[PDB]
């Protein structure tokens, strides 16, 4: 079904004879020549070292927060570590985090009983989920937790517990009690990474290298984690200083601003059309003619 | 005044549903001959015009 256009016709019809006519067998599509990968030129490494190696984490009722921005995050430095008892990601896959960008990342840092690590997931219910730290049901992020008995047991009673991302600081507060005598009763440290995909420029990005930029030629691309394919071109689409993408009626991206030099690129999908095979019947001839619909003959 | 024909549209349903994605196109094959009978219907309308 790829030998010649008559064999595409026979396969399209699920038939070994083709009767006389014109048959749309396939779509012609010019293939991406190469991949263009484009990311902001900033090179600060993100403070995950500070997040995961702090001397004391906070209580789950009064959980700590850090905002991460203007930096490069090699999430494989975290994901490859044997330390983490769970690394479960919601709305993202941990393999893909290095290929990708976010406008901010928030790290939420706190200590819990090991039995309660279950409650730090989107849509959970119970005393930690509902009265201490609630994740939204559309969460886009990773929950990263490990037992911390060597850091946080003594006993130790400085950690306490009693609304998506609320800090609900009368006082219904009850302490944990952490000793080596406590596996599910042990202290667990947890960090939750929340990723901001809102309509703004990227500021946290994976470590993946940028390429040179290609124009007037069909390429695969990734701009700030926006994967796609097209003929990129310079453009007269007059973006205002705050605008970063242009969009089509179908919600698909139609233009981008390069993160490295802030010029505006059109995205045109690579040249395509219906392919129709004009044939007499196979009882008359195996000779065919091919109509490439909606193309100029120089573009075939 | 009488209408006699209408615009001969045709829709490439694999590119409408799974626009240039092999990951999606391999899932769209599991629904069988829906995409080929949508093309058959729109071709029949277009030849009729």
């Amino acid at each position: 079904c790829a030998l010649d256009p008559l064999s595409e016709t026979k396969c399209t019809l699920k038939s070994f004879t083709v009767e006389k006519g014109i048959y749309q067998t396939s779509n012609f599509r010019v293939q991406p020549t190469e991949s263009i990968v484009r990311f902001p030129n900033i090179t600060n490494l993100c403070p995950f070292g500070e997040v995961f190696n702090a001397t004391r984490f906070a209580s789950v009722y009064a959980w700590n927060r850090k905002r991460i921005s203007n930096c490069v995050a090699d999430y494989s430095v975290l994901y490859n570590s044997a330390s983490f008892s769970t690394f479960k990601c919601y709305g993202v896959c941990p393999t893909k985090l290095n290929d990708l960008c976010f406008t901010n990342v928030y790290a939420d840092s706190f200590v819990i009983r090991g039995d309660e690590v279950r409650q730090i997931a989107p849509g959970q219910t119970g005393k930690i989920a509902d009265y201490n730290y609630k994740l939204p049901d559309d969460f886009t992020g990773c929950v990263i937790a490990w037992n911390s008995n060597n850091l946080d047991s003594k006993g130790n009673y400085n950690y306490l517990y009693r609304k998506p991302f609320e800090r609900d600081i009368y006082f219904p507060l009850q302490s944990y009690g952490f000793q080596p005598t406590n596996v599910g009763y042990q202290p667990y440290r947890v960090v939750v990474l929340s990723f901001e995909l809102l309509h703004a420029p990227a500021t946290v990005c994976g470590p993946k290298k940028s390429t040179n930029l290609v124009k007037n030629k069909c390429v695969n691309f990734n701009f700030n984690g926006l994967t796609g394919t097209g003929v990129l071109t310079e453009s007269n689409k007059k973006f205002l200083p705050f605008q970063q993408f242009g969009r089509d009626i179908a919600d698909t991206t139609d233009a981008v601003r390069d993160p490295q030099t802030l010029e505006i690129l059109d995205i045109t999908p690579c040249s395509f059309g219906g392919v129709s095979v004009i044939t007499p019947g196979t009882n008359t001839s195996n000779q065919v003619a091919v109509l490439y619909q909606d193309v100029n003959c120089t573009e075939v | 005044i009488l209408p006699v024909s209408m615009t001969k549209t045709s829709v490439d349903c694999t590119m409408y549903i799974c626009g240039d994605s092999t990951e999606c196109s391999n899932l769209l094959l599991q629904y069988g001959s829906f995409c080929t009978q949508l093309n058959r219907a729109l071709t029949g309308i277009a030849v009729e015009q």
């Binding site: 698909t252 | 001969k8 045709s10 829709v11 490439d12 349903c13 409408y16 626009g19 277009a46 015009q49």
Partner: peptide, 22 residues
């Protein structure tokens, strides 16, 4: 003719008879 007035896989095919054949 004066008084009577795309990439997503949607296409328009031309009629067999042009307005000049009609």
């Amino acid at each position: 003719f004066n008084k009577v007035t795309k990439f997503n896989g949607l296409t328009v095919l031309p009629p067999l008879l042009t307005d000049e054949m009609i």
